[PDB]
């Protein structure tokens, strides 16, 4: 499904996909999941927890650039492989903060998608998917694998 993600989004088939789910951090513990998938296939070894500071106020687009900047500069930093494509949940708004981290002050150039509708492109729009579609499976394998994770 990789290959038809990358050819709806325009991009070369994604072999790493990171995806962020931001839907816990307004628990009493707050947190950001991320799950890797590569090759299409979960990387579940590659899977993190990434507990959060509580969200100042309704602030979430900073949390979320927080969550970008952690993982990444790491990886940066140590020299580990980058995606080839991120995926976080959350609208425009959700999508410009991240945006201009990873351009900004990551220096990359990684195709990034918001989360079920599929919102692609700088400025992003919905991308009109077909439920039955590879692509579609493909991003819903990716969340229920996040869901899966929950007890993590």
Same mark, same amino acid.
């Given at each position: 499904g990789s290959?038809?993600?990358g050819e709806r989004l325009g991009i070369p088939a994604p072999r790493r996909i990171e995806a962020?789910? !931001?839907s816990n951090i307004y628990g009493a513990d707050p947190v950001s999941a991320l799950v890797v998938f590569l090759d299409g296939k979960? &990387?579940?070894k590659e899977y993190r927890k990434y507990k959060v500071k509580?969200?100042?106020g309704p602030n979430d687009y900073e949390t979320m650039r927080e969550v970008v900047r952690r993982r990444y500069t790491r990886v940066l930093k140590e020299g580990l492989p980058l995606?080839?494509?991120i995926i976080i949940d959350g609208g425009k708004g959700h999508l410009s903060?991240?945006?201009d981290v990873l351009? !900004?002050?990551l220096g990359l150039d990684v195709p990034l998608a918001g989360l079920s509708e599929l919102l692609a492109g700088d400025p992003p729009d919905v991308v009109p998917l077909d439920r039955q579609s590879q692509e579609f499976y493909l991003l819903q394998r990716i969340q229920d694998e996040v869901h899966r994770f &929950?007890?993590?």
């Open positions: 290959h038809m993600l962020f789910d !931001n979960p &990387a579940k509580t969200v100042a995606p080839d494509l903060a991240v945006r351009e !900004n002050e &929950a007890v993590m």
